[PDB]
Amino acid sequence: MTDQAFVTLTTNDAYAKGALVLGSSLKQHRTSRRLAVLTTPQVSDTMRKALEIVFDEVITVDILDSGDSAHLTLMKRPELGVTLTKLHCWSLTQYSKCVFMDADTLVLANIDDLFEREELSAAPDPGWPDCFNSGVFVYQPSVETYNQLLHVASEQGSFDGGSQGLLNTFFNSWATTDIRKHLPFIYNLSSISIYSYLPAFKAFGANAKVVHFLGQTKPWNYTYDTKTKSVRSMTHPQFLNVWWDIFTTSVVPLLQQF
Amino acid sequence: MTDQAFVTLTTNDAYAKGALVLGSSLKQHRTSRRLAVLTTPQVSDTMRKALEIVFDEVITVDILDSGDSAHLTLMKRPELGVTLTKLHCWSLTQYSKCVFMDADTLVLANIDDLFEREELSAAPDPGWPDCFNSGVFVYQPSVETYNQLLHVASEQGSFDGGSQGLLNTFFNSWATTDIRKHLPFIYNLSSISIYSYLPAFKAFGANAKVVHFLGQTKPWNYTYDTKTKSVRSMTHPQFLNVWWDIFTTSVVPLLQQF
Ligand SMILES: O=c1ccn([C@@H]2O[C@H](COP(=O)(O)OP(=O)(O)O[C@H]3O[C@H](CO)[C@@H](O)[C@H](O)[C@H]3O)[C@@H](O)[C@H]2O)c(=O)[nH]1
Numbered sequence: 001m002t003d004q005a006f007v008t009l010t011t012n013d014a015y016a017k018g019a020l021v022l023g024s025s026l027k028q029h030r031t032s033r034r035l036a037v038l039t040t041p042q043v044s045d046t047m048r049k050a051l052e053i054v055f056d057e058v059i060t061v062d063i064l065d066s067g068d069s070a071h072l073t074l075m076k077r078p079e080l081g082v083t084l085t086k087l088h089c090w091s092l093t094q095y096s097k098c099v100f101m102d103a104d105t106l107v108l109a110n111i112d113d114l115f116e117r118e119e120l121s122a123a124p125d126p127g128w129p130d131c132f133n134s135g136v137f138v139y140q141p142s143v144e145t146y147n148q149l150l151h152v153a154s155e156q157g158s159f160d161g162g163s164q165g166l167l168n169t170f171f172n173s174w175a176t177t178d179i180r181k182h183l184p185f186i187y188n189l190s191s192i193s194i195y196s197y198l199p200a201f202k203a204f205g206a207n208a209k210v211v212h213f214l215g216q217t218k219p220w221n222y223t224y225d226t227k228t229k230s231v232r233s234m235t236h237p238q239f240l241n242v243w244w245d246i247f248t249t250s251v252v253p254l255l256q257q258f
Numbered sequence: 259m260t261d262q263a264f265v266t267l268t269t270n271d272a273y274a275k276g277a278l279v280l281g282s283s284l285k286q287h288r289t290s291r292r293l294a295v296l297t298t299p300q301v302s303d304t305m306r307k308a309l310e311i312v313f314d315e316v317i318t319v320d321i322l323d324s325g326d327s328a329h330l331t332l333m334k335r336p337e338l339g340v341t342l343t344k345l346h347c348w349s350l351t352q353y354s355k356c357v358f359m360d361a362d363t364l365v366l367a368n369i370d371d372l373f374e375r376e377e378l379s380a381a382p383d384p385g386w387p388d389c390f391n392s393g394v395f396v397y398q399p400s401v402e403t404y405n406q407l408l409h410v411a412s413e414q415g416s417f418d419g420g421s422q423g424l425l426n427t428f429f430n431s432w433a434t435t436d437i438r439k440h441l442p443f444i445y446n447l448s449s450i451s452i453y454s455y456l457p458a459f460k461a462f463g464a465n466a467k468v469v470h471f472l473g474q475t476k477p478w479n480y481t482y483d484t485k486t487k488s489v490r491s492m493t494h495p496q497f498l499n500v501w502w503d504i505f506t507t508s509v510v511p512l513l514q515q516f
C-alpha cells in the first residue's frame with residue numbers, strides 16, 4: 001500500500017505530458033498504491049508543479065552532476081544518459097516493491113495485481129520475444145542491485161543502446177525461467193502490434209490493460225480535434241483518443257492553474 | 259529414435275523445394291530421428307520421387323476426397339484447406355512424439371534435444387508474443403487430439419485464417435503455463451526479426467538453430483548467382499545463401515536423377 005508504488009520517468013517537458021496522462025490514468029482506475037516519478041532539472045517548473053499534484057512523490061535526479069553515483073559511468077558511456085537516469089528507479093528504497101512504467105504508456109484498467117509478481121517480471125518484447133520489454137516491469141528497489149546494474153553498464157554497456165539491452169543482460173534467466181515472470185502481453189501492449197498483427201489484436205485486444213506507444217511518433221506528436229474527440233490522420237486510433245481525452249480533460253486544465 | 263520424427267508438409271511443388279531443403283539440412287546435421295512429410299496429390303510425380311529419397315516416409319493426404327475425415331469440415335470452412343491438411347500431422351500414430359516444421363524453415367544445427375519437450379511446445383510469435391508460432395512445435399500424434407482439433411476448427415474456425423490461430427485457441431494455456439513449453443526463439447527464428455530488430459539479432463543471432471522464412475517472399479522466390487554464391491538484391495542474406503547452397507548442392511542434382 002504505502003510501501004509499494006508505480007514509478008515513471010521524464011527528462012523533458014514532452015515526456016512529462018506522457019507521465020501526467022499515465023499518472024492520471026492510474027488514479028482514474030483507482031490504484032491503491034503510491035505514484036512516483038523521476039525527473040531531471042531540464043523539466044520546466046510548470047511541468048514539475050503539475051507532476052507534484054498528480055504524483056505522490058517527485059524525485060529529482062541529475063546524472064550530469066558530479067555528485068551522482070551514475071555520473072562516472074555516464075562519462076564512460078554518454079549515450080546511456082536516459083538509461084542511467086532510469087536505473088535510479090532501484091534507488092527508491094522507501095518502497096519494498098515497484099512497477100516501473102515508461103512515460104509513454106497508458107493504463108486502461110486497474111493493474112494492482114502486478115504487485116503479486118517478483119523481480120524481475122516483464123512482458124515479452126515483439127520482434128525478439130526472448131527479450132522482455134523494458135517499458136513495464138516489476139522490480140524491488142535496492143542499492144546493491146543498482147550498483148550491480150551500474151557495474152554492468154560500465155563494463156558491457158547496452159547491446160541496444162537503451163535500458164532494454166542492459167536489463168535483459170542482467171536479468172538473463174527471464175526467457176527460460178519461471179513463467180510467472182512473463183507478464184501477459186496485455187500489461188504492456190505494443191501499439192505497433194495493434195495496427196499490424198490485426199488478427200491477434202481483434203481476438204485479444206479487448207483485454208488490454210496497458211498500451212505502450214512505441215514508435216517514433218508519440219501521442220503528443222499528433223493533432224487532436226476536441227469537437228470530434230479524435231486525432232487526425234491508423235485503423236485503431238481508439239487508444240490515442242483515450243490518451244488525448246485524459247490530456248484534454250485532466251492534464252491541460254491542470255497546467256492552467258499555474 | 260524409430261518412433262520419433264520431424265514432420266513437414268507440402269501441398270504444391272514450390273513448397274516441396276522448401277521441404278527438400280529442410281529435409282537435407284536435418285540429415286546434414288545428423289539427426290537420429292525419422293523424417294516424414296505430408297503431401298497432397300497436387301504435388302508432381304518428380305517432386306514426390308525426390309521427397310521419397312530425402313524423407314523416410316511420404317504420406318499422401320487428400321482432404322478434397324470425401325473419404326477424408328477433414329473433408330466435411332473443409333466444406334464448412336473451405337478457406338482452411340492447408341490448415342486442415344496440416345492437422346493430419348496428429349494422425350501419424352506410428353510415432354510417439356514428433357516435431358512439426360513448416361516447409362519454409364531451415365535447420366542450421368542439430369535440434370534433436372527438442373524431443374525432450376512435451377506437447378505442446380513452441381517458440382513465441384513476434385508481433386503477438388503471447389501466441390506461439392505454429393511454424394515449429396513439439397506434439398504427440400493422437401486420433402483423439404486430431405478429432406478434438408477438427409471439432410474446434412468446425413465450430414470456431416481460426417481467428418487468423420491459418421493453423422496458428424487454431425492451435426493457439428486449442429493449446430491456450432501456453433502463454434501462462436510451463437516455461438518449458440516456450441521453445442527458445444532460436445529454434446524458430448523469424449527472418450523478419452533478423453533484418454528488423456538488428457540489435458537483438460547482432461547479440462543472439464549467432465546461436466540460431468532454425469530460421470523461419472515468414473514473409474510473402476519465400477527463399478525460392480529469389481534469384482541466386484551460383485558463381486558468387488549469393489542471392490540478388492537485405493542486410494543479412496546469409497541465411498538465404500545457406501538455403502540456396504543446399505538447394506544448389508543437394509536438391510537440384512537430385513531432381514536431375516529423374
Ligand atoms: O528523452 C527522453 C527519452 C525517454 N524518456 C523515458 O524513457 C522511457 C523509454 O523511452 P521511450 O522514449 O518511451 O522509447 P521506446 O519507444 O518506448 O523504446 C525504447 O524503449 C523500449 C522499452 O523501454 C524498448 O522496447 C525499445 O526497443 C526502445 O527503442 C520513456 O517512456 C520515458 O519515461 C525520457 O524521460 N526522456
Ligand SMILES: O=c1ccn([C@@H]2O[C@H](COP(=O)(O)OP(=O)(O)O[C@H]3O[C@H](CO)[C@@H](O)[C@H](O)[C@H]3O)[C@@H](O)[C@H]2O)c(=O)[nH]1
Pocket residue numbers: 266267268269270273340344359360361362363383391392393418420421422471472473
Ligand atoms: O500453399 C501452401 C501454403 C502452405 N503450406 C505449408 O504450410 C506451412 C505454413 O505456411 P507458410 O506458407 O509457411 O506461411 P507463413 O509465412 O510461415 O505463415 C503463416 O504461418 C505461420 C506459422 O505456421 C504464422 O506465424 C503466420 O502468422 C502465418 O501467416 C508452410 O511452411 C508449408 O509447410 C503448403 O504446403 N502449401
Ligand SMILES: [Mn+2]
Pocket residue numbers: 102103104105135212213214
Ligand atoms: Mn516507452
Ligand SMILES: [Mn+2]
Pocket residue numbers: 360361362363393470471472
Ligand atoms: Mn512458415
